[PDB]
Design an enzyme around this catalytic site. Structure first.
Site, PDB file in Angstrom:
ATOM      1  N   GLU B  56       0.841  -1.192   0.000  1.00 35.66           N
ATOM      2  CA  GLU B  56       0.000   0.000   0.000  1.00 35.66           C
ATOM      3  C   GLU B  56       0.868   1.230   0.000  1.00 35.66           C
ATOM      4  OE1 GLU B  56      -3.708  -0.505   2.299  1.00 35.66           O
ATOM      5  OE2 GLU B  56      -2.570  -2.001   3.385  1.00 35.66           O
ATOM      6  N   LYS B 237      -7.558  -4.581 -23.830  1.00 37.87           N
ATOM      7  CA  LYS B 237      -8.280  -4.581 -25.087  1.00 37.87           C
ATOM      8  C   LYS B 237      -7.319  -4.543 -26.270  1.00 37.87           C
ATOM      9  CE  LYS B 237     -12.374  -2.321 -23.095  1.00 37.87           C
ATOM     10  NZ  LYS B 237     -11.834  -2.497 -21.730  1.00 37.87           N
ATOM     11  N   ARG B 243      -5.677  -7.616 -17.484  1.00 37.67           N
ATOM     12  CA  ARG B 243      -6.830  -6.819 -17.098  1.00 37.67           C
ATOM     13  C   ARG B 243      -6.426  -5.845 -16.009  1.00 37.67           C
ATOM     14  NH1 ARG B 243     -11.132  -9.198 -19.671  1.00 37.67           N
ATOM     15  NH2 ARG B 243     -12.579  -7.606 -18.876  1.00 37.67           N
TER      16      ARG B 243
END
Ligand SMILES: COC(=O)c1ccc(-c2cc(C#N)cc([C@@]3(C(C)C)C(C#N)=C(N)Oc4n[nH]c(C)c43)c2)s1
Ligand SMILES: COC(=O)c1ccc(-c2cc(C#N)cc([C@@]3(C(C)C)C(C#N)=C(N)Oc4n[nH]c(C)c43)c2)s1
Ligand SMILES: Cc1ncc(COP(=O)(O)O)c(CNCC(=O)O)c1O
Ligand SMILES: Cc1ncc(COP(=O)(O)O)c(CNCC(=O)O)c1O
Ligand SMILES: [Cl-]
Lengths: 442, 442
Positions: B56, B237, B243
């Site tokens: 994080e 794409k 992804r």
């Protein structure tokens, strides 16, 4: 019309750092309570072509077809989640599309309350998560304090949830959700008393069990399913799954929660699901139910109890003076050092741990503790006897930190200047790397 | 204390579906405009152990340590992103942690405006994405329509963006963001005109290039970087990555948008980043910048140009009567069949495509078109000559659909009843599978 060369050939720059990471992970005593190690089977899923597929919507309710085999996978994953948490698929639903714990919480919260929605969660400094409605005065740090109206309850001076203060808060402030289940909480939770407070004020009960999921599954700890309308968990922590999240909802306690929550995930917040995630959660969830995984979970607690014990045997103060779970928060006050300082000191000797706040703390900066947990090491074959060694190492770290602060100053800039080249740290890293490098490694 | 049993032996149930999925993919003519196939090297990252880490924060500014190798991995990713989109790291920043396009858009939107903020985007039925503020009369379907106040601009009957309408709207509604960049839009965008309207109203210019990212990188289409404050793109794409998403921000036009966007991602919305995502994105972004990938992208358009031409030669109406990019939207009115039906007819023959709305349409159910695109098949190595055959298959699909609608009725389940066992669909499937099964498969 593609390149099919393996990673070593295709991007030698990257493969290097990834093999370096491997070595670092292999040669580390990893005490991050939120971390674990996945097996090869789970990583084979995350690496699977199943992630080529846009499959927006739900199984049998897709926007596209060609989702014949994807539907099966999403269904198997839901079958196994409810199986593994011992809930009847007639009383409980599960969403398996949330991308991570933070997304799942935001999504589930929105479902229950919506914008301007009123929520109650535990404060960050007390062991609550950011997504439980965290704000500072100056900024609404988490969206959960911003898209929602949030009030935060603290733990008492002894580090325990004060159900009294929750009541004082819940009745006056009157929220629609109360969140329990925390990020750095060493003790078990009285869910039933939460259910008692929620009823009194007509609030939903939200249990985020991300840290303790396996315990809950393996009936080693309290069951929130008996009392909660929603239950969220991440899959990458104690559950030793991939990075993802699950949303559980009590159909019986509030029917039409299914549509409400299934739509919050999509189309409210998310787009296409990550099927490789789903496929991997599926893979880990098979393991979760087996009595072999139950052995591992028990082992985690055995190790945590032993570690706590060994730390106390060395005059080290713990918050709540002990643990009910996989995690211990060390209180450092008696040593006059920060968690910030000790985290660095441990990094130098290949000991992953994180700084943590305690109850007397007043800032997320200069916190007076560290948080350790046992899931990773337990996964690497460590047993209770091994806990004295980790305790030994943490004590030595603490002593060296106290020495280095005396020599270079309480200022962090200064302090780290003392760190590299230090004879004893090099000695200790060495011992650490020796022992760590030779344990089982998925 | 783990199982290292490989996927085939650990979970046989699951491996089979994945093997089945693999086979379907290998044997399908895939015309989902938003789909693609990733190489084995990108899948090697998604499977990497780097996802064990909790990191994080941002590089050099973590909450933990032992992020030495991850900080490098995250850094190389932002390097290669800005490289690939040919922007100076002095002028532009990029966030590489968004988990998917929808999270990125939600995050980026929030950073710019915040809760109850005003945004403008294209309507779904006109080619806009859900994340661009989509609502229906009955419900605010996307959070972007609920946590923001959204207004939606439609294209003209011709199927083109009516820039007049956008000003008519922007000046009266007066939003703080305007979004351009769409999900099913066949033509290029006049970004300058968007920049022109945003200036008049002191609004930000949000360009979502998820569908057309590669074009823009490779300089085949208009460049949004010349005019836009934020640029979001997915990476799975036309970009053919994993992804994930990237958020791009103009520092020179908007100083202190860096912290705004970086803090929107974490800790406003997300928790730990998914480092395997980051690692996989990095890998693909190297490939993006090579002269060889520009070839692939040119090939995509070459194919889409050829497919459009071939379809028109067969008396098939396209929206905007052609394409500037990778995607065509067929208008089905002259045939009196819906998109929904033709999708079904196509799934039966291993032709993947999706129902899509048109300008005349007034419902997201029973839309009058199908949206096809070329990025996947080009990946399989298809060339312009192979576009006649796909056009041929679609024509035959459309024909068979009119026959089945004639025989079994205009109603969906009834139409489906004709679908299985049909002599002609079985001959056409075989025909599809034969040609597809033999194409290069990463
Ligand atoms: C404006 O944003 C912020 O102020 C912060 C963001 C994250 C913060 C944080 C600081 C510390 C410290 N010291 C510790 C955390 C923990 C740790 C587990 C890492 C934390 C604690 N203590 C708790 N309870 O919850 C957490 N959620 N996420 C993170 C990184 C944390 C968060 S403070
Ligand atoms: C309450 O939720 C809804 O009404 C909808 C959710 C998704 C909807 C949708 C319906 C169709 C159709 N027909 C098509 C879409 C597209 C398709 C590309 C799949 C779409 C169109 N047309 C556009 N432009 O944007 C989209 N974003 N996501 C999806 C699935 C879509 C979305 S409608
Ligand atoms: C209660 C809780 N919920 C959610 C998350 C994390 O969600 P992501 O998967 O989006 O990070 C955590 C982990 N919090 C950080 C830690 O324990 O170190 C958590 O403790
Ligand atoms: C403009 C735009 N933005 C975002 C997304 C998708 O975000 P996720 O990566 O979160 O799914 C899409 C694709 N939308 C679906 C499609 O074209 O099929 C899109 O077209
Ligand atoms: Cl992933």
């Amino acid at each position: 019309m593609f390149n099919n060369e393996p990673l070593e050939q295709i991007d030698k720059e990257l493969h290097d750092i990834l093999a370096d990471e491997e070595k670092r992970q292999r040669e580390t005593i990893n005490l991050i309570a939120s971390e674990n190690l996945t097996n090869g089977a789970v990583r084979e899923c995350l690496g699977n072509r199943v992630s080529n597929k846009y499959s927006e919507g739900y199984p049998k309710k897709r926007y596209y077809g060609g989702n014949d085999f994807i539907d099966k996978i999403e269904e198997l994953c839901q079958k196994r989640a409810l199986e593994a948490f011992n809930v009847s698929d007639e009383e409980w639903g599960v969403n398996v599309q949330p991308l991570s714990g933070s997304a799942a919480n935001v999504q589930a919260l929105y479902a229950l309350v919506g914008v301007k929605g009123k929520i109650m969660g535990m404060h960050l400094c007390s062991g609550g998560h950011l997504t439980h409605g965290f704000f500072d005065e100056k900024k609404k740090v988490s969206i959960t304090s911003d898209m929602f109206e949030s009030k935060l309850y603290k733990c008492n001076s002894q580090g325990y949830v004060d159900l009294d203060a929750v009541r004082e808060m819940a009745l006056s402030f009157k929220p629609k959700v109360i969140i329990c289940g925390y990020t750095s909480y060493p003790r078990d939770i009285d869910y039933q008393q939460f259910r008692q407070i929620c009823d009194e004020v007509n609030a939903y009960l939200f249990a985020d069990i991300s840290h303790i999921s396996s315990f809950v599954a393996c009936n080693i700890l309290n069951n929130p399913f008996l009392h909660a309308d929603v239950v969220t968990t991440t899959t990458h922590k104690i559950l030793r799954g991939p990075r993802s999240a699950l949303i559980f909802f009590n159909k019986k306690r509030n029917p039409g929660i299914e549509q409400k929550i299934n739509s919050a995930v999509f189309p409210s917040f998310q787009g296409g699901p990550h099927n490789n995630k789903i496929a991997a959660v599926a893979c880990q969830l098979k393991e979760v139910h087996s009595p072999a995984f139950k052995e591992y979970t028990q082992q985690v607690l055995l190790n945590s109890k032993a570690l706590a014990k060994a730390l106390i045997s060395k005059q080290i103060d713990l918050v709540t003076n002990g643990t009910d779970n996989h995690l211990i928060v060390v209180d450092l006050r008696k040593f006059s050092i920060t968690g910030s300082k000790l985290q660095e000191t441990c990094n130098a000797i290949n000991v992953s741990l994180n700084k943590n706040t305690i109850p007397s703390d007043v800032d997320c900066v200069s916190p007076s503790g560290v948080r350790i947990g046992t899931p990773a090491m337990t996964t690497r074959g460590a047993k209770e006897k091994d806990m004295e060694f980790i305790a030994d190492v943490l004590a030595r770290a603490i002593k060296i930190t106290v020495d280095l602060q005396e020599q270079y100053g309480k200022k962090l800039v200064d302090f780290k200047k003392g760190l590299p080249g230090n004879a004893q740290l090099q000695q200790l890293k060495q011992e650490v790397v020796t022992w760590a490098g030779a344990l089982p490694f998925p």
